[PDB]
Structure formats: C-alpha cells, structure tokens
C-alpha cells in the first residue's frame, strides 16, 4: 500500500498530520475527504510559495499596462522577473507593455527601522512621471505590516495627486499557507476597485475567460478557436490583459472559469453583482476542449453558434489526428505521475490517457478541499488559524447593471442536460478509480512514489525536474512548459505530445551506464 509506504518514515507527530493529506479514489468512496489548505510542516521540503507570489507574481503581474511596484527588499522583485511566462503584446500594436521590467522600492535598513512610506510615495510618483501607465499596483512583502507602513493610505494619497488609479495589495508573504492566499487578496481588490469601472458597450456573444494567464501563448490559442466559432472575447483575467479590459469585465454574458482556485472569488461575485453566470473551462486536451465548447453552445442556445461549434471542432480535430495517432503509437502503455500547483491535474491526466498513458499519482502544492471534492463541501469547511485573517468580501447586486442573463427556466433545463452552470464538482469527480492524490506533496513523498511505482515520467516544476531526471525518469514541466507552448487548445495538444515524445525517445537516457560497468 503506497500511502502506508509514504507515511512510514515520518516521525509520529508528522505522520499523524500528513496522513489525512493522502487519499485514494475508490469505487466504494469515489469522493474521499482530504485534508487540505493547512500550514506546511516546517523542514519537510515543500514546493509551495507565498502569498505575494500568488498576488503579484500570478494574478496581477500579467496586466501589461499597469506598473507593478513591489514594496519590499529587492529579492521579492528580482524573483518575479520573467520566470513565469505570461505573454503580452502591445494593445493594437501600440499600447504600453511593461512585461520586460520589474519595479520596486528596494527597501534598505533605514526603511526597516524608520518606515518605508516616504520611499514608496517617491517611487509611485517616479513611476507615474516616467511611464504614465493606466494604473499603478503596490504589493506588500514580508516586512511591510511589521514596520508600520500603511500602503493603503499612501496609495490613495498618491492616486488623488496623480489622477490615475493606485491599488494597494496587502500580500505579505507569510499570510495564509501558500500562493492561494495571494489569489484571494488580488481578487478582492480587482473586484471592488477595477471590475465595472468602465463604460464600453457590450457586444453580441460576449464571454470572459477568467483564471487564464496566457502562459506560453495559451490564451491566444484559446481565442483563435473561440473567435472562429463566433464569440467576442471581452476580457481575459488576466493573461495579455489591459487595465481597461479588466475594468470592462462586466460586459459579458458568460464567464468561463479556467483556473477555479485562483479566480473563483471573482466568478461568484460577478454572478451576485451583475447576474453573469459561469461554467468551468477545461481547455487542456481534446476531451475537455470539446466539452467546454459544447457546454458554451448550449448556454447561448443559438442555432448558428451551435452549427459553427461542430464544424470548427471537426476541422481542428482532423488537422491534428495524424499527430494524435503518432503520440499514442509512441507512448501507449507508459505510466506517469504529475505534480501541479492548484489546478489542471485531471485535464493533463485525460490528455495523457488519450495517448495511452496511465496516470497513477497526482500531487498538489496547495489546492483547497473545494478543488478536490467540489464546492458542495464549502459549507463543511472551517478556516484554521493560519488562513482566518484574509478578508472575505461581500458584494450586493448593482441595481442599475444587474441582468438576468439566462432565465431560471433555461438554467434548470441546462443542468438536466448535464451543463454544470455556476458550479464545480472538483478534480476527483473525473479521475479514474485507484488514483492516489497527495496534498502538499514533498520531496520525501515524491521519492517514495518514484522508487515504488517506477513511473516512465513524472511531470512537475523547476525545483523537481532535475531531481527526477538524475534518477533516469523524464520530467516535463507543467508550469513553464520547458520554455515552449502553447499547451492549451487544439494546437497545444500537438505541442505537448511532440515535446513529450521527443523527451521519452532522447537517446541519452540509454547511455547513462558506462560500458566499463
């Protein structure tokens, strides 16, 4: 039993706390309760990051015409300099794009001892005068609250003087237990202070793609197919986004939720405030893409859209079918494990299974219980001491802007037809019986999985890649895509398969043992 083998070496106190983070999906219990979103055990060798990474590095950073100022010492800024591969182009070929810069206050000892607010004020004004961006962001780091800096007040004072928005984010690294806290902090300010501040007129067949960051061009590949079918992509939060598009996010009829973990707060709040319903978007792998596009067609219920949907699916599949056949011939019968942050595990497992590759273990950094088991468990969840501090925002319907987008009659018929409107059943729902899931996976856990299962491949991140490969096992990166992509969309399935087959069949794997041994 793999769970027992993983847990055995832990000291008693640690074994007791970790046991609940490992589950097995079975026919007897297909939706097992998992312990998730708790603090990391000190010293156990995690892959988790911090709330500032979640807020600045993940959600906010990709807004290309907003200057993002890290208020902290220099490292917080340096380690967000191009490592995460959100792609940006200047809007209409001419707009501002700050992707190639990182901005900070470069806190020194004097700022720690006497407060940093004067330096932050000067930095905001310098950014404004040098770049005239659409908006400025100020992001807290570890020292900021402790040394007494009120960034909310510095930001509001600056905004009044310079005449553009300045948004403060209290995303100190130690808040919460992972990147997740950072997502939540970002969602709160984007919702209250940016979304709905615009005045543009809504177009027909308008959708948003929420929780999509255009890593390696993913969003542009999504948009290619969505625009061919006939939709207007109003806003992507926040991959390749301008500030003004986020401000106009309320101008849509349907919200596609790609990353539930990072953007669910905004999805719920837009539904409450504006009446806009959402559906889960699964744009990795042929099965998920097609289901997503069919679900969308049924929400809009337009005979034309529907016919175009089928024509485009058929033509995109036909163009890649020879590649798909190749992948399966080259890979079928191989086994994998995967390690993600907070999302995507089932879609990658499904894409891999379309190539004949079975996935045995799915590890996670920081997914919540609602991500594993579904939102239906949100009533039963109780926030522990380490995450109870993160504000929970409440919105009310906008009397003037609210609209019933899909009448309750049609909502009822859609759910009967299998369309999960404004709900999400969780990652495990879809996984095959026997799948083992590990929450907050660590180095020890990963090494037991490698030694006992001997998978042909283990997909992970940059910290684990070379660890796995030193042992002779292929490890393709699921975050950076090893500096390629897209991996999303129809063309992404081909990019992923091509790079995977190239990896598996690299000749050096068989040359590791020298001939004198």
């Amino acid at each position: 039993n793999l769970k027992d083998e993983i847990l055995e070496k832990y000291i008693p106190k640690t074994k007791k706390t970790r046991s609940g983070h490992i589950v097995i999906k079975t026919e007897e219990t297909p939706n097992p309760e998992i312990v998730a979103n708790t603090r990391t055990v000190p010293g156990i060798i995690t892959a988790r990051g911090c709330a500032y990474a979640g807020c600045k590095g993940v959600v906010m950073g990709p807004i290309k015409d907003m200057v993002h100022i890290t208020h902290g010492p220099i490292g917080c800024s340096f380690y967000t300099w191009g490592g995460r591969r959100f792609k940006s182009k200047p809007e209409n070929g001419t707009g501002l794009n700050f992707n190639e810069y990182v901005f900070s206050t470069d806190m020194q000892e004097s700022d720690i001892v006497f407060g940093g607010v004067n330096k932050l004020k000067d930095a905001i004004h310098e950014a404004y005068e040098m770049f005239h961006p659409a908006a400025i962001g100020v992001y807290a780091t570890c020292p900021v609250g402790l040394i007494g800096d009120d960034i909310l007040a510095v930001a509001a004072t600056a905004s009044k003087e310079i005449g553009i928005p300045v948004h403060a984010f209290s995303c100190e690294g130690y808040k919460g237990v992972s990147q997740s806290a950072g997502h939540h902090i970002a969602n709160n300010t984007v919702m209250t202070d940016i979304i709905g501040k615009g005045n543009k007129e809504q177009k027909k067949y308008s959708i948003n793609v929420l929780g999509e960051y255009n890593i390696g061009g993913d969003a542009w590949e999504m948009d290619r197919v969505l625009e061919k079918i006939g939709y207007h992509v109003n806003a992507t939060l926040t991959g390749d986004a301008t500030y003004e598009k986020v401000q106009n996010a309320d101008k849509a009829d349907l919200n596609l939720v790609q990353c539930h973990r990072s953007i669910n707060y905004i999805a719920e709040m837009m539904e409450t405030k504006y009446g806009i319903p959402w559906i889960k978007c699964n744009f990795i792998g042929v099965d998920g893409i097609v289901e997503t596009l069919r679900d969308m067609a049924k929400c809009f219920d337009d005979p034309e859209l529907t016919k175009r949907t089928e024509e485009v699916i058929a033509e995109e599949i036909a163009a890649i079918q020879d590649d798909l056949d190749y992948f399966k011939e080259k890979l079928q019968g191989k086994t994998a494990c995967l390690y993600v942050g907070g999302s995507r595990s089932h879609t990658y497992m499904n894409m891999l299974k379309s190539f004949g590759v079975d996935s045995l273990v799915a590890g996670f950094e920081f997914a919540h219980r609602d991500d594993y088991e579904g939102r239906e468990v949100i009533p039963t969840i109780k926030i522990d001491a380490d995450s109870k501090n993160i504000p929970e925002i409440t919105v009310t319907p906008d009397e003037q802007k609210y609209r019933v987008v899909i009448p309750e009659d049609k909502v009822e018929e859609l759910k009967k037809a299998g369309v999960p409107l404004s709900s999400y059943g969780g990652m495990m729902k879809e996984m095959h019986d026997g799948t083992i899931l590990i929450d907050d996976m660590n180095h020890h856990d990963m090494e037991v999985v490698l030694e006992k299962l001997k998978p042909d491949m283990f997909f992970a991140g940059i910290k684990e890649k070379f660890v796995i490969q030193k042992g002779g096992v292929l490890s393709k990166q699921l975050h950076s895509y090893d500096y390629n992509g897209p991996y999303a969309g129809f063309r992404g399935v081909v990019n992923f398969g091509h790079e995977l087959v190239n990896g598996i069949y690299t000749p050096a794997w068989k040359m590791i043992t020298p001939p004198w041994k």
Partner: protein
C-alpha cells in the same frame, strides 16, 4: 523590446528598475551547498526558499535542495522559535544531513529572531542527534546583496567549525568567493599543479555541476568535508579571493584561530591571475611549473593574435563587485575600454578600484556606478553607444534592443547550457573569455557587412 525606457535621463531616487543584484539568502544557500552533506535551511516564510532554490536550478540546470521554517502569521506575531525546532526534528529524521546550515530572511530579521537561543535550546532538548551539527548566519535582505549573504555564511562556517588544535596541517586555506563550480575546479587545479596542499571552502564543484549516473543522490559527492572545515584553523595561511565575498570569513578565521590571511582579486585576466600565482609561490617557495607558464604564454599569444578586434572597443559591464573589478582590469589589459561599469552591490571599494585602473590607463569619460541598475545602463547606451555588453542573462534585452555583441557572465545565466563547466578564472578561463568576446564581435561584423565586404580570413 524595452519600449518604455526614455532616452532622456530624469533623476531617479526611489524607484528601482531591473536590478543588478538580488538579496542575501541565495548567496548563503549557495555557500551552504559548498559543504558536503549539508542541507541549507531558510528561516522564514517559504516563498523565499522556493524562489532561492528556483534560481539555482535555472542557472545550474541541477537540483538545489533546501528546507524552510515555513513562517505563517503565527510566527509573524510570536517569532519563529517553534517553527525551527519543528523543522530540525523533521530534517534529521526524514533527510539525515550531517549539518544543517541556517540563514535568515527579511522576515525573521525584521522580527529579531534569536537563532543562538533556539539552537542551544535544541541542543538541551536532544533534538540534534549525536555527531550532527546546526550552524547559522544572519542574512537580512535589506542589507547588501547575495554576495553579502555568501560572505555571511562563510563567516558562520568559521564561527561554528574552525578550530586551532595545535596540529599544523601544512595547508593553505582558499576562500574562492562568489564564483561558479568550474572556477573552483580551476583554482584547485592550479593549487595541485604548483604542488601546494590546501583546503577550499566553500566548494560547490561536484555539487552544482554534477554527473547523471541514473541514481539521484540528495547530498552529492562534492562539497568541503566538515572534518576539513574544522581543520581550517590549523592551516598556515588563508587566501581570500574577492574582498566582498571572502574577507569577512578570512578575517574571522584570523581573529578566532590566528591564521593570517592575504586578500587577492578574483583571478580573472593577466594581472589578477599573475598575482594569485605569485602569492602561492611567495607563501610556499614552490616554483611555477612549465604547464602554468605555457598556458600564460598561450593567453598572451591569443591576446596579441586577436588584438585588432579588441583595441579601443567600448564595453558595458554589469555584475557582482569582485568579478567586475577583475574583469574590468582584463578589459583594459585587452586594450579595450570599460565605458559603463555597474554593480548593484553597495560599497565604496568598487568605485575606488575601477576609478583607479581607469586613471592609470588614461581613460576619461567612463561612468562607474555603485547601486546602479540595468535601466541606468540602458539609458546611458541610448545616449552614447558601446561595442560590447557583458552581464548576466538580464542583459539580453539591452543586447537585442540596441544590437550589441553580448557575453553572458556572472549570476544568474539561465538561458544557455554548459556555462557551469566553463572556467572564467586563471589563464585557462581568460582564454575562454577572449574566445567568447572575439566570437561575438566577429559574428556581428559578419552578420552586418555587405556581401562585397565578405571575408574568408579574419
């Protein structure tokens, strides 16, 4: 590419853009990986550890292990004592290093965590098993840079480990500074060729430049052994290579164990390699062997053979102070001109040494900046151009936007493979540098010439 960078320079005193430094902790993490069977430990919030491990893997294309105390809001209110005691219990049982080397973050420093107290409480409770070790240093990120962090960790090693026991080892200590594993290998090769026994610490060769054997080893073969780190207090002399990275440790060892020390420039180029060889010879009376003299003569031969492509060339350099001081001198020795010379690491020494060598060579009109950044240099370049750029990966943007020949040097280099096998120090390393420099200069000449100016011989 870099569209927002104005050509006209407006005064800038608060907003830091595109830094030419990072924070202390990764420098200490790197030093700690230079100890055999050591787990580096980051005492703070886990975001730091993940980011610091990450850059080392991007640079070396290798694993980079480290643990963290994982501070939450609880530790932010009550301090990190309980977190590090919990860590140490899990570390020794799960991962069994021989030594845990603890550094701190901006968080634990702002809080004033008392590591010496937590460590003696751990000793008392028996949390540190017999024959295991826990050491620390303090590495506040709002002071200095990653170079400072490396320096502080080397001091930590001597604070906790070095002991003079009366039993002279006949060895020279060498602290190689903030340099790569290939440079440590080359420095060792030269000690061995002169026949001089030594202890190098830290030493990341065989740790961050390691082979694939089909078996992953959490603690690779390399790294200076604990028993030899203890023995550094019985040596005859310490050679401190690069004052910013290495002096603190060398001076600490002198105070603690009475080992005298000598400060040398990082041995890049002719004079700085010559000074290193002369120090080894003067300290031991050993002769310089023919092999070393032949390499030097081959470097000179190359410098003369390639001279036409180097004379009067204007060079922009950004990086860490020890390395950029030595490399600036080499640029002058090549007949070229350090035109724009910047480090993000604070300190008076850099400004003085660069100004001095520039005056000696008759060079006026150069700009030298301590705590300058890539944005400074880019703005300077738009006003008056250069012929060559040397920096870490982050110079690639300037290089492309301004069409400048570009040589990757220093830390981090995340976008080319094998640099961690290539020395840049010694006569061997100097040869590599001249090859790279002339290669990119020649490549540009050939990309841009008209077809009628096309040349078989150069």
């Amino acid at each position: 590419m870099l569209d927002a960078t104005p050509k006209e320079i407006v005064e800038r005193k608060a907003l830091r853009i595109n830094p030419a430094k990072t924070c202390q902790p990764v420098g200490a993490m790197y030093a700690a990986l230079g100890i055999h069977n050591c787990l580096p430990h980051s005492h703070g919030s886990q975001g730091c550890c993940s980011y610091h491990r990450t850059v080392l893997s991007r640079h070396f294309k290798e694993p980079a292990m480290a643990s963290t105390s994982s501070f939450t809001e609880g530790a932010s209110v009550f301090g990190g004592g309980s977190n590090i005691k919990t860590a140490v219990k899990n570390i020794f049982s799960l991962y069994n290093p021989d030594i845990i080397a603890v550094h701190t973050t901006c968080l634990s420093e702002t809080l004033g965590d008392d590591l010496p107290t937590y460590i003696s409480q751990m000793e008392d409770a028996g949390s540190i098993p017999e024959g295991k070790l826990v050491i620390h240093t303090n590495t506040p990120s709002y002071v200095g840079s990653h170079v400072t962090g490396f320096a502080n960790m080397v001091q930590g090693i001597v604070n906790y480990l070095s002991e003079n026991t009366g039993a002279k080892n006949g060895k020279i200590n060498v602290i190689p500074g903030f340099v790569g594993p290939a440079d440590m290998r080359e420095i060792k090769r030269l000690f061995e060729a002169m026949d001089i026994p030594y202890i190098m610490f830290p030493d990341t060769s065989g740790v961050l430049d390691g082979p694939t054997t089909g078996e992953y080893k959490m603690y690779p073969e390399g790294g200076t052994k604990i028993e030899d780190l203890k023995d550094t207090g019985n040596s005859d002399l310490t050679l401190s290579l690069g004052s910013y990275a290495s002096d603190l440790g060398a001076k600490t060892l002198e105070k603690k164990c009475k080992v005298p020390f000598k400060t040398l420039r990082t041995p890049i180029g002719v004079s700085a390699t010559d000074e290193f060889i002369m120090a080894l010879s003067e300290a031991t009376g050993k002769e310089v062997p023919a092999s070393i003299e032949e390499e030097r003569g081959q470097l000179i031969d190359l410098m003369i053979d390639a001279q036409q492509y180097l004379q009067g060339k204007k060079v922009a350099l950004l990086g860490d102070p020890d390395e950029i001081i030595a490399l600036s001198k080499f640029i002058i020795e090549l007949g070229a001109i350090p035109k724009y010379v910047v480090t993000g690491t604070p300190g008076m020494k850099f400004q003085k040494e660069i100004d001095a060598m520039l005056a000696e060579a008759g060079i006026e009109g150069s700009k030298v900046k301590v705590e300058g950044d890539f944005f400074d240099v880019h703005q300077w370049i738009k006003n008056e151009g250069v012929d060559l750029l040397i920096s870490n990966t982050y110079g690639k943007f300037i290089a492309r936007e301004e069409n400048i020949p570009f040589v990757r040097f220093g830390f981090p280099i995340m976008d080319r493979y094998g640099h961690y096998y290539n020395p840049k120090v010694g006569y061997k390393g100097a040869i590599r540098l001249v090859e790279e420099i002339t290669n990119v200069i020649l490549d540009k000449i050939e990309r841009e010439c008209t077809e009628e100016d096309f040349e078989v011989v150069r």
